[PDB]
Amino acid sequence: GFNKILVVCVGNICRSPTGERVLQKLLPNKTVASAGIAAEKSRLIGKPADAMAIEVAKENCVDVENHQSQQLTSALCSQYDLILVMEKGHMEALTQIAPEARGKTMLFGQWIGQKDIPDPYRQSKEAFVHAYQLIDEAAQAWAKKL
Ligand SMILES: O=P(O)(O)Cc1ccccc1
């Protein structure tokens, strides 16, 4: 039984808050949160989701308001049943932080051909559109399996 899901990216301002809120809307009886591998080093802790990420999600009827970026820690990992990373490369960075969490760590895009979800940060709204499309397709697949 996977009830608590942690969506992980690097800053926790773009992809991972979007994935959190998209999955949360699809799985209302589950607890979905998100965290960033380098949120602390990037000085992003407490920051809201990127304005374009909020805007694009809003246009797809998903609320990414009231988000606060947080750092991924071993303690945080122990609280969640399933961990979903945005890129395959994030796994090595995750294991460095929480080696014990590798067993429950999977790819957000696992069921859509194990696709990595590209970072739209610092780019135009079109890049955020692209990322949302992939996150949406990926989350819809996870929801069918959970
Ligand atoms: O939260 P994301 O989607 O990784 C965007 C981002 C945020 C900070 C540093 C790099 C990339």
Residue numbers in the entry: 1 to 146
Article sentences:
Protein tyrosine phosphorylation regulates the production of capsular polysaccharide, an essential virulence factor of the deadly pathogen Vibrio vulnificus. The process requires the protein tyrosine kinase Wzc and its cognate phosphatase Wzb, both of which are largely uncharacterized. VvWzb belongs to the low-molecular-weight protein tyrosine phosphatase (LMWPTP) family. Interestingly, it contains an extra four-residue insertion in the W-loop, distinct from all known LMWPTPs.
In the presence of benzylphosphonate, a compound that mimics the phenylphosphate moiety of the substrate phosphotyrosine, VvWzb and VvWzbC9A crystallized in space groups P1 and P212121, respectively. We were able to model one benzylphosphonate molecule (with occupancy of 1 and B-factor of 82.8, 142.8, 109.6, or 89.9 Å2) for each of the four protein chains in the wild-type (WT) structure. In VvWzb-benzylphosphonate complex, the substrate-mimicking benzylphosphonate is located at the bottom of the active site crevice. Its phosphonate group forms an extensive hydrogen-bonding network with the P-loop, including the main chain amide groups of the residues Val10, Gly11, Asn12, Ile13, Cys14, and Arg15, as well as the sulfhydryl group of Cys9 and the side-chain guanidine group of Arg15. The benzyl group of benzylphosphonate is flanked by residues Val10 of the P-loop and Tyr121 of the D-loop and further stabilized by Leu44 of the W-loop and Ile13 of the P-loop via hydrophobic interactions. Compared with the free structure, the W-loop undergoes a dramatic conformational rearrangement from an open to a closed conformation. Consequently, Glu40 is no longer oriented toward the active site cavity but turns outside. Instead, side chains of Ser42 and Leu44 turn to face the active site, forming the W-loop wall. In addition, side chains of Asp119 and Tyr121 of the D-loop also made small local conformational changes to interact with the ligand. All these conformational changes significantly reconfigure the active site crevice, which is narrower and deeper in shape as well as more positively charged compared with that of free VvWzb.
